[PDB]
From Swiss-Prot:
PTM note: Phosphorylated on tyrosine residues. The unphosphorylated form increases the initial rate of actin-nucleating activity, whereas the tyrosine-phosphorylated form inhibits actin-nucleating activity, enhances actin-bundling activity and enhances actin-severing activity by reducing high Ca(2+) requirements. The tyrosine-phosphorylated form does not regulate actin-capping activity.
Family assignment from sequence similarity: Belongs to the villin/gelsolin family.
Localization annotation: Cytoplasm, Cytoskeleton; Cell projection, Microvillus; Cell projection, Lamellipodium; Cell projection, Ruffle
Tissue occurrence: Specifically expressed in epithelial cells. Component of brush border microvilli.
Subunit-level organization: Monomer. Homodimer. Associates with F-actin; the association with F-actin is inhibited by tropomyosin.
Protein name: Villin-1
Positions of region (Absolutely required for activity): 29-32
Reported function: Epithelial cell-specific Ca(2+)-regulated actin-modifying protein that modulates the reorganization of microvillar actin filaments. Plays a role in the actin nucleation, actin filament bundle assembly, actin filament capping and severing. Binds phosphatidylinositol 4,5-bisphosphate (PIP2) and lysophosphatidic acid (LPA); binds LPA with higher affinity than PIP2. Binding to LPA increases its phosphorylation by SRC and inhibits all actin-modifying activities. Binding to PIP2 inhibits actin-capping and -severing activities but enhances actin-bundling activity.
Annotated domain remarks: Consists of a large core fragment in the N-terminal portion and a small headpiece (HP) in the C-terminal portion. The core fragment is necessary for both actin-nucleating and -severing activities, whereas the HP binds F-actin strongly in both the presence and absence of calcium and is necessary in actin-bundling activity. The Gelsolin-like 1 repeat is necessary for the actin-capping activity. The entire core fragment is necessary for the actin-severing activity.
Amino acid sequence: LSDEDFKAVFGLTRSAFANLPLWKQQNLKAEKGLF
């Protein structure tokens, strides 16, 4: 998960992802297949 890859696959920055609730974080990770 490089910065641009993160932003690409999540459609948001690490900060904006961290801004998300834990369940949303895990949801997005799982959705992208990132364990």
